Design an enzyme around this catalytic site. Structure first.
Site, short mmCIF file in Angstrom:
data_model
loop_
_atom_site.label_atom_id
_atom_site.label_comp_id
_atom_site.label_asym_id
_atom_site.label_seq_id
_atom_site.Cartn_x
_atom_site.Cartn_y
_atom_site.Cartn_z
CG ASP A 1 5.56 11.54 12.32
OD1 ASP A 1 5.97 12.66 11.07
OD2 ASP A 1 6.52 10.71 10.69
CG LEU B 1 -2.42 -1.11 1.12
CD1 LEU B 1 -3.04 -1.04 2.56
CD2 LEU B 1 -2.96 -1.10 -0.36
O1 NBS Z 1 5.04 7.47 6.40
P1 NBS Z 1 4.83 7.38 5.97
O2 NBS Z 1 5.71 7.36 4.38
O3 NBS Z 1 3.91 8.38 5.34
O4 NBS Z 1 4.39 6.13 4.99
P2 NBS Z 1 3.62 4.85 6.09
O5 NBS Z 1 4.66 4.88 7.48
O6 NBS Z 1 3.45 3.59 5.47
O7 NBS Z 1 1.55 5.45 6.40
C1 NBS Z 1 1.61 5.63 5.38
C2 NBS Z 1 0.86 5.28 4.06
O8 NBS Z 1 1.15 3.75 3.73
C3 NBS Z 1 -0.34 3.73 3.62
N1 NBS Z 1 -1.29 2.84 5.11
C4 NBS Z 1 -0.48 3.16 6.32
N2 NBS Z 1 -1.16 3.10 7.70
C5 NBS Z 1 -2.60 1.84 6.10
C6 NBS Z 1 -3.83 1.91 6.37
N3 NBS Z 1 -4.06 1.66 7.61
C7 NBS Z 1 -3.74 1.64 9.25
C8 NBS Z 1 -2.76 1.19 9.41
C9 NBS Z 1 -1.57 0.28 9.00
C10 NBS Z 1 -0.74 -0.37 9.41
C11 NBS Z 1 -0.56 0.04 10.82
C12 NBS Z 1 -1.48 0.44 11.87
C13 NBS Z 1 -2.28 1.09 10.97
N4 NBS Z 1 -4.45 1.60 5.50
C14 NBS Z 1 -3.71 2.09 4.38
N5 NBS Z 1 -2.77 2.49 3.39
C15 NBS Z 1 -2.53 2.82 4.80
C16 NBS Z 1 -0.92 5.02 3.13
O9 NBS Z 1 -1.06 4.94 1.99
C17 NBS Z 1 0.90 5.89 2.82
O10 NBS Z 1 1.04 5.53 1.93
#
Ligand code: NBS
Length: 450
Positions: free
Chosen positions: A303, A190
């Site tokens: 953050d 994702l």
């Molecule tokens: O910090 P950045 O680089 O922006 O990127 P990440 O730390 O991966 O978090 C945001 C990016 O990853 C995707 N994303 C992150 N979380 C989700 C999510 N659910 C929340 C969640 C996930 C995992 C563990 C706990 C809660 N559902 C859909 N997409 C999600 C986004 O598309 C974005 O690009």
């Protein structure tokens, strides 16, 4: 003494208990928190069950059109969903008066469009209930069922209960917290953050979950486990819930899957093309609201930014990645430096003295606010990271953005006041945004319109 299934619920483990909406359950051991050991009366099977999935037989919570303690703003959110035919309704508790209830209904005005009328339900000494004095009942259910047939002065007849999604079970299962790695199957990539990857996946081949992977060395596991402990205690409607974690590297973080992606992304492209001021503001207030609880919880995000704001159906916003940054062991990052530290969002005192407090976050929100009013435009447009701290230190601040109302720029400024505690509170930011356009969340209908 029996409980009734508000929703269906699939068997996730070898030790829980499946069921259908309407299915009665004996709560044969309430001595827990989010998962009750129960016994099904129809099937007669025994196992654990998600507490927020039931309600007592004959109770009000058993009622599918009763929304509990939801804010008028929120219900309006729900009701205003386009698919909702006129007369979609719900019954929640009034916030203005303790004890009284509120019947909210969707309506349509040839000259005003879709909207939601609210009708306060008063409960007399007698114990009666009524919206109008000329018709009272003994139970909200008699009231509801009544208006389900006849409008009677209401703006319209209560056609359909308000549709809602199965809610979040706190945790994947009872005692489930540090789950085996093999219990997660990563399916769809994702996003690729700076310290890890995030995948949509399945826990135990049944559940739709979101997993975050962290490159090794990223953070101390023991420390993570400790922080996770704290995080896990933060439950809020506007905060991406945490479910379970894989402590050993490659550490995994398993939480709620938010379909609609990062608010940054969503903000740009077509998704945010027909975004109007009123909707943007709302996103902000949702964020404030979330941050408001972090604040009451005496916690720190460290953050906060659009990129860490996830989107959900009905334009819902939840704050994510709270805490984690404080566990990042990368040298440069520790010194608030390098190509991986979100400086343009960092309050000066935090960059300079590592003094990360709620007040620094308020700063962050300020920046985030401009992101909102500029379709995800990277802030400080004409400055590379390296010269930003410098500039802001000296008092430089992003001027009012193009097409952003001045009032919002002034809000922003208040968020950037050099003095940490001169910067306003989230509880405040939440109130401020929550009522921009002459609407303090009041005004209910009178009684018999006809
Ligand atoms: O910090 P950045 O680089 O922006 O990127 P990440 O730390 O991966 O978090 C945001 C990016 O990853 C995707 N994303 C992150 N979380 C989700 C999510 N659910 C929340 C969640 C996930 C995992 C563990 C706990 C809660 N559902 C859909 N997409 C999600 C986004 O598309 C974005 O690009």
């Amino acid at each position: 003494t029996t409980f009734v299934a508000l929703y269906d619920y699939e068997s996730r483990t070898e030790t829980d208990l499946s069921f259908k909406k309407g299915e009665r359950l004996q709560i044969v051991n309430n001595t827990e928190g989010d998962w009750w050991l129960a016994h099904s009366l129809s099937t007669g099977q025994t196992g654990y069950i998600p507490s927020n999935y039931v309600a007592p037989s004959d109770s009000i919570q058993a009622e599918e059109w009763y929304f509990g303690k939801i804010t008028r703003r929120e219900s309006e959110r729900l009701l205003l969903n386009a698919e909702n035919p006129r007369g979609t309704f719900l019954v929640r508790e009034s916030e203005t008066t303790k004890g009284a209830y509120c019947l909210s209904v969707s309506d349509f005005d040839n000259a005003k469009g879709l909207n939601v009328k609210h009708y306060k339900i008063r409960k007399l000494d007698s114990g009666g209930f009524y919206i109008t004095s000329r018709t009272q009942f003994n139970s909200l259910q008699q009231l509801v069922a009544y208006y389900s047939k006849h409008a009677d002065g209401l703006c319209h007849r209560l056609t359909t209960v308000c549709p809602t999604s199965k809610p979040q079970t706190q945790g994947l299962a009872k005692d489930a917290w540090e789950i085996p790695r093999e219990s997660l199957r990563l399916e769809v990539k994702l996003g690729q953050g700076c310290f890890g990857e995030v995948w949509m996946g399945t826990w135990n081949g049944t559940t739709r979950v979101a997993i975050k992977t962290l490159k090794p060395g990223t953070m101390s596991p023991e420390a993570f486990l400790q922080e996770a402990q704290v995080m896990k205690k933060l439950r809020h409607e506007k905060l991406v819930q945490l479910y379970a974690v894989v402590s050993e590297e490659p550490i995994y973080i398993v939480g709620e899957y938010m379909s609609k992606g990062s608010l940054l992304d969503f903000l740009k492209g077509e998704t945010g093309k027909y975004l109007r001021l009123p909707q943007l503001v709302d996103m902000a207030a949702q964020i404030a609201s979330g941050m408001a609880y972090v604040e009451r919880m005496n916690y720190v995000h460290r953050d906060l930014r659009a990129a860490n704001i996830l989107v959900g159906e009905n334009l819902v916003c939840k704050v994510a990645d709270f805490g984690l940054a404080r566990l990042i062991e990368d040298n440069e990052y520790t010194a608030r430096q390098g190509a991986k530290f979100p400086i343009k969002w960092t309050a000066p005192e935090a960059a300079l003295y590592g003094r990360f407090t709620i007040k620094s976050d308020v700063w962050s929100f300020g920046i985030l606010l401009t992101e909102l009013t500029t379709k995800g435009r990277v802030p400080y447009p004409g400055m590379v990271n390296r010269e930003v701290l410098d500039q802001v230190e000296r008092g430089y601040r992003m001027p009012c953005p193009p097409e952003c109302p001045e009032s919002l720029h002034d809000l922003m400024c208040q968020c950037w006041r050099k003095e940490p505690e001169e910067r306003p509170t989230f509880e405040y930011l939440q109130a401020f945004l929550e009522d921009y356009f002459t609407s303090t969340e009041p005004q209910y209908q009178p009684g018999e319109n006809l």
